[PDB]
Design a protein around this ligand. Structure first.
Ligand SMILES: [Zn+2]
Lengths: 59, 73
């Protein structure tokens, strides 16, 4: 039997966790969240700066 | 399930929601706890402004997902 974790940590991967073991799955999940959180902040800042400009040319 | 809504001021709002909840319904909840009128709210998730008539599930917003909130001035 050779269904080892896709990250090569040595433990067995879960088909439900896309071939990852618990720890590696959890690490990937956190990194994916962190990236989108950060990027969504950048977008929000951009949106704020857009609001500030529309408010300026208004009142 | 709970989701989190971060503002640009470091504030985090916790919400009790369901995947089938509309964005409009989420905006009403935010109004209940923060007093912000729904029409002033701009919600963001995964690089998109969220449209009032779509669902949380339409954007793959799951348990412990974090959205962002900007206010119209
Ligand atoms: Zn692993």
């Amino acid at each position: 039997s050779e269904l080892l974790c896709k990250k090569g940590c040595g433990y067995y991967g879960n088909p439900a966790w896309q071939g990852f073991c618990s720890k590696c799955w959890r690490e990937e999940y956190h990194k994916a969240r962190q990236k989108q959180i950060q990027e969504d902040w950048e977008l929000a800042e951009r949106l704020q700066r857009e609001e500030e400009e529309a408010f300026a040319s208004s009142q | 399930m709970q989701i989190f809504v971060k503002t640009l001021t470091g504030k985090t709002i916790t919400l009790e929601v369901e995947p089938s909840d509309t964005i409009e319904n989420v905006k009403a909840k935010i109004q209940d706890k923060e007093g912000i009128p729904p029409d002033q709210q701009r919600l963001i998730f995964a690089g998109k402004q969220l449209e009032d008539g779509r669902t949380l599930s339409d954007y793959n917003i799951q348990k412990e997902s974090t959205l962002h909130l900007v206010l119209r001035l």
